[PDB]
Design a protein around this nucleic acid. Structure first.
Lengths: 969, 1013
DNA sequence: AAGCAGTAGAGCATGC
DNA sequence: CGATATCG
DNA sequence: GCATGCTCTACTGCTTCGATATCG
């Protein structure tokens, strides 16, 4: 499939019949691009990177050897449209082709002629160079041709039509963004050209100012006026001129379509706010007028662009009335009366109040010390708006779920400068914070990080006040955990939020004005123990013999607590093991002591062992252990306890306690490894049909062999190794299908195997010496290997004569059986397992059917102990068969055509050592039901006509019962 | 510039890829990293690993040793992997700690000697020094650290090449390495150490003509340096130098002692070298020089244990030469100085002290007490059965308190030999002869604090068979009384046991536990036992046992032995462990070998309420008893048989396959012995181990045949039993034993061979392969079924001859059908006497019938068993002589001093009866060890058979015809054409295999041995 | 100018 | 008429 | 109740071609 199309591409780069296989090559590129997105598997993702990074087929030389042709234009366009989606179909593993695609785009700027093919090359170009951030590769992106070659592409070109004239200004600001240290000595004439270009494009007389060179020149002006930001500190002439440029670029009352230039001016004035500082005194009124006009233009990205420009201008207004608090009384007075008029309470739906919220939270700052009493009614009026506007339990018609973090950041910023809180509205404030942090997963990216900065801002706010208030943060996370763990959105967007708040506090501290993650981690571990206290997880039997104890009571007491217990353990797995560096010092004893104090009361609840695994893994991640001794000896007494407790269990708890047991420190527990060796024996046996226990068993055998003294373990290699032989034997389819026309790309942005273990087993088996490896195959050479290598009888009975029309030969229909039964026991394949079971049922019926006219009691004893373990095995179909079969044969063998033929006592001893055995627990239950049926139909038929010397009678099996009751085993 | 251009032009196309990358990929990666494309090399080595797994997967599970030869290469594969990963990532730029760590894990991770052949050794060491040279050239103390690493791995390869019989490779490596050991000193002295050790190991293989020349070569290389200014610094260098030089002087003075003067004829300057260091006045000079160097060696971990032990063996062979000085003091001094330490060879060297104390009592016996006082007591446990019988011997008091230490620590094993030794222990009149009565009474009191062991022995005793003990009593009285009643107290001392066990039905009820059938038979011995108690008490009748004969006639009628329960013995049926009564701790443990920890010992808990009786010539009984550690253990019981000598020969099997696990070529094929276990609880009662689903050989060969093949083989006038006996009666004129004496005067060498072929023709030849295909049904498993059986059968048929055993008929061979091994049992005759003391002497060394022949079709039976037998003998005759001394102190130990042996032949089915009269002497514990030492030291096996046949059947009528049968004919047999002494291993086993199959020998032999099948 | 193709931007039901 | 722009 | 995803569609624009002023 793959790579044969690429060799056909190589064979058809120079094939005959020009203008004759364009559709062939185009459907070739579209066919590979279909199944290059129709695979959510990282193995083929690692394959295709090494595919496309080749020098024979692929892209890097095919962009150089297939240009001057008419046979393939759509191919040349489709490959450059497909590369810009494979730029982010993979990660950033395109870094060793920065310079290769650099000389590629030089070559396709020069040699190709087309423009609709020129554009997607520029697309993948600029998106790659934005994907790179300031590093080594831009030093080999030569600015001596990047600036000067593409800048003489401006000079030695007249009638530069549209779409390259914008793209060259895109390139020079792209490289101005990414690593501008190469762009020191090319600064002066370029801004004069940027003045003159928009000057003749707009401020000329009769020319229609066309959009694209305006968009390109403004994006370049922003991306190059930032490295060398021109405030009233660089030049107070082009500050004035650029000011009038961008202001005429955002002139209103020009009602149109294709709103490139207004959104461009909004995105530019987002960044360049603090620069034109002294010129922000001239026309603040009409500045605010056009802000109030274009705030509600009702276009989708224009709303966000308008409000961002709005808040930036408000930030600079607040900064200038802060730093220049003497002469600005009139200006602050105007904005004061303006915002109190807009907050006045008349009819404002979600526009005047939504602009009131942000400006109110920001203008809390300046007027915070002139009066201090309007500051006191500040946040009181704000609560008297937001509390009544929020929480009405309107099920249908109150979705303000997109306006929330604005409210949160504003109420935080007004909460800061106050003192002596009114402190009665605080159980409304904490309810607000838990509501906002509860309805978090129905957001989008770049909403979430704003919300995270908001919640971290308010937690910084209400924690410098006083410890009389420092418990609101304690209780809000307590309520939040029991909210988010209750609802089975399930839980998988709060996880990175909790990561971002404590983990990446360190990227919030810069702009906003300690021990924050300390405090939040302490509160989180306190909450996760206080929740796991009050749960009442017990199970009660509903109304057979249960001999297991993860037993036949499927019913626990409160079933809606188990869901919010397993969500608790999964959330704990996802948030705990990150950053056990400095915070996880003191809880190593108390939390472990708490968990074992609960788990001693109830053994058979999983996830407790997973909590123990988490704390012991962080305890090994820290050192701390070179000998408190209390908890040391506590784990010593605990490990042997669980290692003898885990014997008579079943699988889903066995895996959890094994993940505990083999995650002990255990280089410091050097003693009694003979009690750990059946755990590591069962771990690899329960591998090869489940991955991670088989991973961690090898990961712990490595730790044992590399850190323990290799003399106690030197006899303990004859029974670790020789079991290892088994190891060494969505909307993307519709978002890619109909072209790569960038809305499909926007919808793409909207939307350990066994062989690595094989390699690691080989690396282990090699690294562990020569003299030790030899036992790995020398296991017994007398077991069921040889018992599968022995004939099951001396002579072969049961001769089957296949029906034909003329010949009818004979076939020994027993030679299949030592593969048939090993197949039908466990096939590990659901299609062939049922066929094996049906064949074996018919085989058993046939071997019974021949017996009415040779001895087979050597074969019955070899037959039955798989018939039992398939009668009660796992599945419904394999239970519905072999259960009436085994009742049929047990009732036939307890009858009169029966009655004391070695076959009957053979069946009896078969089910008896079915009963007595090590762990196969369900089987013993089944054959207990069988001996009950035996006891029924055996004695409920025979009258005392020969019922006096029948050794199959119940007295004999009573003596057998006494023998089984009399053993030191 | 020859191979890289060939591969760089050959790497093209499909057919020059699908073989060249399918096969190798690894040396391809190696020459690629020689041309330095590591990522290409990474791809080729990952292909190598995946190819290893894929090549592993298609092999089968039971095809052994190909899995091993594949598996050994993974060290090299991951060594290249670690090297390429280490040289790629560059956190190891100038920080030397990854080099320190990699040096450490290299010098730890080693391929072992004795299991890795030299090619894989060469592969891994060449790869490792090649990668180290690659680091040396790439990244331009530290280089001297590299050089020390190189030389240490090289000398390790030398000392591994010495052990695996590969001398020429070590010759070449030591020859190329001498230019290296000149910048240093210890490198040079380890060079000459390895040289003299290799010449030592070569000299044992070499002939005496070659021996003198190679030891003159190594003493010529013992004229150089390393004595100046370093033997003062490292005193251990001086010590090991004196060790090796004493070993050289030892072996040359050994060399000029076997041949008297013929070796001292041809040399000139080396002849002057011999006498410059007559013809006796320099032999004693070399012996004095060797003793002086050994004295300096023992004057100056565990680097001095061997130094003590070689001087001990030196004076020990000197003492044996003297009997066939202060040296008996010196040997016990340094020997117990060794055995105080953790040793094994000294642990096997205890009867040297135990006999030299008796032979040299004036020689420092107070020193013997003072040195035996200070010793850990977890050593003497295996050698207890001799010290328990030593108490009756005068001066048994060179040790008492260490014996009492062993009793007061671990009494529950010593309780079994003590009843046997106290059964016969008669002291003397002197005051030390009453202190020994005091000692045996105080240790009889310090033992049996519980008082249940004797009860358990009694309860196990009273489940036996009464008719067997009746025949035992009848043959004992017919032996000891029908000749002359001059015997003191013997009639009463035998009649007290006959009245105690199987007397009236109440004397066992009082003196023992009443079994549920002595009320059926000791009750039944009432009316004919009344006359027994009247006259049989003190009869001295000395003429008559026909009344015993008619009663053993009519006492087999109602014989019913299947109790099938433990109501037969009511003591242990209701055991029910109660409290600490110092529990029995089931016999068969405490083998020695370290500190025994009885917390893991299994406590005997329950017995089974079903027994099975066997079909043998004593009809034994088995039990399926159950231990405290949840499992079962079956055992078989035997009443009326001494089981101490068999324990000794099992210990001999243990020590000889301890030797087999030491050298190389037998370890690499994993040849061991199936060593089962016996325990002698009291005299004439012991327990024997019984293994799992095991068939006798005659049972297998009888079960293989058809229903009509059985009747045509057995119940027929043309039966090869009946045909052989009919032909032998018609060629004799008589009808019983003695016709095998009439046949050797009146039968010819070749017509007997034809008449032998007449009965060989009847039985089929494919019986063994028919039994092997009856169970296998798989050509994948048939190979590893045949090979292990043939290997084990050859090994036991060559280890049943060094200590000469006879009487191997088909019931003495046990095959395990699940695995395919074969083990033999029932050691009747320890040394070569089974061909001595019989009427018709069997003359073959072991079984090799036509069945072991016709299994090996289409090979001649000279390729498979030959290699393992020559490996066996080359492993045997390169020892210090442990097997020799252990056999000597076994046969000299008093347990079978001809009276126990004749009673043992009466305990089996006795062909020999009477008329000995000179056979009381010519037992001769010098002749047996002399001739075993001859047949180990190189002897034609047609001479040893003649020697013992003359010693056992001098003045016999038919003697020279017996020797002429076992002598050859100078054309038909190689043994008459080969010489009589001074042979080698290949011709030894050639003569032995031709001696085994020889259709004149298989002509006339005893019909119970069944020579046809 | 003609033929014609891309494409932002506005509009109708739908999921959470 | 011939090199060079102009422009719908 | 809102952000978003599926259509429509008309503006924009891009190439192609051709008819006229400017300077040696």
């Amino acid at each position: 499939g793959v790579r044969c199309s690429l060799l056909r591409l190589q064979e058809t780069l120079s094939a005959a019949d020009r203008c004759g296989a364009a559709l062939a090559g185009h459907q070739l590129i579209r066919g590979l691009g279909q199944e290059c997105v129709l695979s959510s598997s990282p193995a083929v993702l690692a394959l295709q990177t090494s595919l496309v990074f080749s020098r024979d087929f692929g892209l890097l030389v095919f962009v150089r050897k297939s240009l001057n042709s008419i046979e393939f234009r759509e191919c040349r366009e489709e490959i450059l449209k497909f590369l810009c989606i494979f730029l982010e179909k993979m990660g950033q593993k395109i870094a060793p082709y920065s310079v290769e695609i650099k000389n590629t785009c030089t070559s396709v700027y020069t040699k190709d002629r087309a423009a609709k093919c020129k554009i997607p090359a520029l697309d993948l170009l600029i998106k790659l160079l934005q994907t790179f951030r300031s590093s080594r590769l831009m030093d080999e992106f030569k600015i001596g041709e990047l600036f000067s070659k593409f800048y003489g592409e401006l000079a030695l070109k007249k009638k530069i039509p549209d779409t390259v004239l914008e793209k060259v200004y895109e390139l020079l600001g792209l490289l101005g963004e990414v690593h501008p240290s190469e762009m020191i000595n090319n600064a002066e004439n370029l801004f004069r050209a940027f003045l003159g270009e928009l000057k003749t494009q707009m401020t000329s007389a009769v020319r229609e100012p066309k959009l694209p060179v305006l968009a390109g020149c403004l994006k370049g002006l922003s991306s190059l006026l930032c490295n060398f930001t021109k405030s009233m500190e660089e030049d107070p002439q082009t500050s004035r001129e650029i000011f009038n440029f961008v202001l005429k670029a955002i002139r209103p009352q020009i009602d149109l379509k294709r709103y490139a230039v207004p959104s461009a001016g909004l995105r530019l004035f987002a960044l360049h706010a603090s620069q034109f500082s002294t010129c922000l005194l001239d026309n603040y009124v009409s500045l605010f007028e056009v802000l109030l006009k274009w705030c509600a233009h009702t276009n989708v990205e224009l709303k966000k662009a308008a409000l961002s420009a709005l808040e930036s201008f408000l930030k600079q207004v607040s900064n200038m009335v802060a730093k220049n608090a003497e002469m600005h009384k009139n200006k602050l007075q105007y904005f004061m009366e303006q915002f109190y008029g807009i907050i006045r309470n008349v009819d404002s739906n979600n526009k005047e109040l939504s602009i009131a919220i942000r400006g109110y939270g920001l203008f809390a700052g300046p007027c915070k010390v002139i009066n201090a009493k309007d500051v006191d009614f500040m946040y009181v009026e704000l609560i008297q708006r937001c509390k009544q506007m929020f929480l009405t339990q309107t099920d249908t018609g109150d979705d303000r779920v997109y306006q929330m973090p604005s409210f949160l950041q504003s109420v935080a910023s007004v909460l800061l400068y106050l003192d002596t809180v009114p402190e009665v509205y605080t159980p409304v404030l904490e309810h607000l914070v838990v509501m906002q942090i509860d309805s978090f997963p129905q957001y989008s990216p770049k909403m979430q990080l704003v919300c995270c900065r908001a919640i971290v801002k308010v937690f910084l706010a209400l924690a410098a006040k006083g410890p009389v208030l420092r418990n609101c943060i304690s209780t809000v996370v307590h309520q939040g955990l029991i909210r988010i763990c209750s609802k089975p959105p399930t839980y998988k967007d709060y996880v990175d939020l909790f990561r971002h708040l404590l983990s990446s506090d360190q990227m919030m501290d810069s702009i906003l004005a300690e021990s924050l993650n300390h405090l939040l981690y302490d509160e989180f571990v306190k909450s996760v123990l206080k929740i796991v206290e009050k749960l009442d997880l017990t199970l009660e039997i509903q109304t057979m013999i249960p001999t297991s104890d993860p037993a036949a009571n499927l019913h626990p007491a409160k079933p809606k607590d188990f869901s919010a217990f397993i969500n608790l353990v999964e959330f704990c797995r996802e948030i705990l093991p990150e950053k056990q560096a400095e915070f996880f010092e003191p809880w190593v004893y108390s939390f472990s002591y708490e968990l074992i104090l609960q788990s001693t009361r109830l053994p058979l609840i999983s996830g407790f062992y997973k909590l123990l695994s988490i704390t012991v893994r962080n305890a090994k991640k820290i050192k701390y252990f070179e000998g408190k001794y209390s908890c040391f000896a506590l784990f010593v007494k605990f490990g042997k306890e669980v290692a003898v407790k885990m014997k008579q269990y079943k699988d889903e708890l066995l895996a959890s306690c094994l993940t505990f047991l083999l995650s002990l420190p255990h280089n410091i527990i050097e003693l009694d490894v003979r009690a750990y060796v059946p755990a590591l024996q069962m771990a690899f046996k329960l591998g090869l049909s489940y991955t991670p226990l088989a991973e961690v068993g090898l990961n712990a055998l490595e730790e044992w062999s590399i850190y323990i003294d290799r003399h106690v373990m030197q006899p303990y290699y004859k029974d670790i190794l020789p079991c290892l032989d088994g190891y060494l034997k969505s909307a993307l389819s519709r978002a890619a299908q109909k072209g790569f026309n960038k809305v499909v790309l926007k919808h793409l942005k909207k939307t350990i195997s066994l062989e690595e273990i094989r390699i690691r087993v080989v690396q282990m088996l090699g690294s562990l010496g020569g003299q030790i490896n030899k036992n790995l195959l020398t296991v017994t050479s007398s077991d069921e290997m040889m018992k599968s290598y022995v004939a099951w009888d001396r002579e072969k009975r049961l001769s089957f004569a296949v029906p034909f029309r003329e010949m009818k030969p004979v076939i020994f229909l027993d030679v299949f059986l030592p593969r048939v039964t090993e197949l039908a026991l466990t096939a590990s394949d659901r299609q062939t397992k049922v066929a094996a079971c049906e064949l074996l049922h018919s085989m058993v019926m046939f071997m019974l059917g021949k017996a009415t006219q040779p001895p087979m009691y050597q074969l019955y004893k070899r037959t039955f102990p798989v018939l039992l373990r398939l009668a009660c095995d796992v599945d419904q179909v394999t239970r519905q068969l072999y259960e009436p079969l085994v009742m049929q044969l047990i009732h036939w063998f307890t009858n009169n055509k029966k009655f004391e033929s070695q076959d009957t006592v053979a069946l009896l001893e078969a089910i008896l050592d079915g009963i007595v055995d090590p762990v196969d627990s369900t089987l013993r239950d089944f054959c207990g039901r069988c001996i009950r049926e035996f006891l029924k139909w055996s004695i409920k038929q025979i009258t005392p006509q020969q019922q006096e010397k029948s050794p199959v009678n119940t007295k004999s099996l009573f003596k057998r019962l006494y023998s089984l009751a009399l053993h030191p085993n | 510039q020859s191979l890289l251009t060939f591969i760089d032009k050959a790497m093209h196309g499909e057919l020059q890829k699908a073989i060249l990358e399918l096969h190798y990929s690894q040396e391809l990666s190696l020459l690629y990293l020689l041309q330095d494309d590591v990522d290409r090399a990474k791809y080729y080595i990952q292909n190598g690993i995946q190819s290893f797994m894929q090549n592993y997967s298609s092999i089968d599970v039971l095809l052994h040793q190909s899995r091993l030869t594949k598996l050994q290469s993974v060290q090299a594969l991951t060594e290249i992997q670690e090297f390429i990963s280490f040289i790629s990532k560059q956190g190891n730029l100038s920080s030397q700690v990854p080099l320190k760590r990699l040096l450490n894990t290299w010098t730890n991770r080693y391929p072992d000697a004795k299991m890795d052949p030299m090619n894989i050794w060469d592969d891994i060491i060449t790869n490792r020094c090649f990668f180290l040279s690659k680091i040396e050239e790439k990244l331009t103390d530290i280089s001297s650290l590299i050089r020390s690493c190189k030389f240490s791995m090289k000398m390790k390869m030398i000392d591994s090449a010495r052990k695996q019989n590969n001398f020429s490779l070590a010759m070449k490596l030591l020859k190329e390495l001498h230019k290296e050991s000149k910048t240093r000193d210890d490198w040079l002295v380890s060079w000459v150490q390895s040289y003299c050790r290799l010449s030592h190991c070569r000299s044992r293989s070499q002939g005496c003509s070659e021996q003198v020349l190679t030891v003159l070569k190594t003493v010529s290389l013992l004229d150089e340096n390393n004595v100046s200014s370093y033997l003062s610094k490292n005193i251990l260098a001086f010590r090991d130098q004196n060790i090796l030089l004493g070993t050289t002087y030892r072996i040359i003075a050994n060399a000029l002692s076997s041949e008297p003067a013929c070796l001292a004829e041809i040399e000139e300057d080396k002849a002057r070298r011999i006498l410059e260091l007559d013809s006796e006045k320099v032999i004693a000079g070399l012996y004095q020089r060797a003793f002086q160097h050994l004295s300096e060696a023992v004057q100056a971990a565990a680097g001095v244990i061997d130094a003590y032990m070689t001087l001990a063996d030196f004076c020990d062979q000197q003492l044996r030469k003297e009997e066939e000085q202060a040296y008996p003091a010196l040997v016990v001094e340094k020997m117990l100085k060794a055995l105080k330490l953790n040793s094994n060879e000294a642990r096997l060297k205890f009867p040297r002290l135990l006999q030299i104390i008796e032979r040299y009592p004036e020689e420092t016996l107070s020193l013997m007490t003072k040195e035996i006082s200070s010793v850990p007591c977890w050593q003497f446990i295996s050698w207890i059965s001799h010290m328990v019988a030593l108490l009756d011997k005068d001066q048994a008091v060179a040790v008492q308190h260490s014996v009492e230490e062993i009793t007061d620590n671990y009494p529950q094993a010593i309780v079994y030999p003590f009843i046997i030794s106290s059964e016969s222990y008669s002291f003397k009149d002197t005051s030390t002869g009453h202190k020994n009565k005091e000692f045996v009474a105080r240790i009889k009191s310090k033992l049996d604090q519980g008082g249940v062991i004797q009860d358990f022995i009694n309860a196990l005793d009273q489940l036996s068979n009464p008719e067997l003990l009746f025949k035992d009593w009848s043959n004992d009285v017919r032996a000891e009384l029908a000749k002359t009643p001059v015997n003191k107290k013997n009639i009463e001392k035998m009649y007290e046991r006959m009245y105690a066990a199987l007397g009236d039905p109440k004397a066992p009820g009082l003196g023992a536990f009443r079994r549920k059938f002595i009320q059926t038979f000791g009750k039944e011995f009432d009316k004919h036992f009344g006359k027994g108690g009247s006259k049989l008490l003190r009869m001295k009748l000395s003429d008559f046992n026909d009344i015993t004969n008619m009663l053993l006639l009519k006492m087999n009628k109602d014989s019913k032995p299947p109790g099938n329960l433990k109501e037969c013995s009511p003591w242990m049926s209701d055991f029910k462990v109660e409290f600490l009564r110092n529990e029995l701790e089931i016999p068969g443990q405490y083998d020695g070998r370290g500190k025994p920890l009885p917390e893991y010992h299994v406590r005997i808990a329950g017995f089974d309420e079903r027994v099975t009786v066997m079909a043998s010539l004593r009809r034994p009984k088995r039990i399926i008893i159950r231990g405290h550690d949840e499992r079962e253990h079956p055992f078989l019981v035997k009443g009326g048989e001494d089981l101490r000598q068999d324990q000794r020969v099992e210990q001999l099997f243990q020590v000889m396959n301890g030797i087999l696990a030491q050298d190389s070529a037998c370890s690499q094929r994993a040849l061991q012995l199936r060593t089962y276990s016996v325990v002698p609880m009291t005299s004439r009662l012991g327990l024997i181990e019984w293994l799992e689903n095991t068939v006798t050989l005659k049972d297998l060969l009888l079960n293989t045949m058809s229903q009509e093949e059985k009747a045509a083989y057995l119940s027929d006038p043309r039966a090869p039993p009946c045909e052989y006996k009919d032909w032998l009666t018609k060629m004799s004129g008589k009808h019983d034993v003695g016709a095998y004496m009439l046949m050797y005067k009146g039968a010819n060498r070749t017509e007997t061979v034809t008449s032998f072929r007449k009965r060989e023709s009847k039985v089929p030849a494919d019986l063994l392969k028919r039994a092997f295909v009856r169970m296998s049904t798989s050509p994948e498993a048939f190979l590893a079924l045949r090979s292990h059986f043939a290997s084990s059968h050859a090994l036991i048929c060559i280890s049943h001859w060094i200590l000469g055993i006879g009487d191997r008929h088909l019931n003495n061979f046990m095959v395990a059908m699940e695995t395919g091994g074969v083990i033999g049992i029932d050691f009747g005759h320890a040394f070569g006497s089974a061909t001595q003391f019989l009427p018709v002497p069997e003359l073959m060394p072991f079984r090799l019938t036509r069945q072991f022949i016709n299994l090996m079709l289409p090979m001649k039976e000279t390729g498979l068993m030959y290699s393992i037998m020559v490996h066996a003998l080359r492993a045997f005759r390169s020892d210090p002589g442990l097997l020799t001394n252990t056999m000597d102190v076994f046969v000299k130990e008093p347990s079978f001093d001809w009276k126990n042996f004749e009673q043992k032949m009466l305990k089996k089915g006795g062909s020999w009866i009477q008329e000995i009269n000179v056979a009381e002497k010519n037992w001769y514990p010098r002749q047996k060890i002399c001739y075993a030492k001859r047949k180990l030291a190189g002897a034609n096996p047609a001479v040893i058979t003649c020697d013992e046949l003359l010693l056992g059947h001098e003045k016999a009528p038919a003697f020279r015809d017996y020797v002429a049968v076992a002598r050859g004919s100078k054309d038909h047999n190689i043994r008459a054409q080969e010489p009589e002494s001074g042979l080698s291993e290949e011709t030894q086993v050639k003569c032995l295999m031709d001696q085994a199959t020889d259709p004149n020998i298989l002509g006339r032999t005893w019909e119970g041995w069944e020579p046809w099948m």
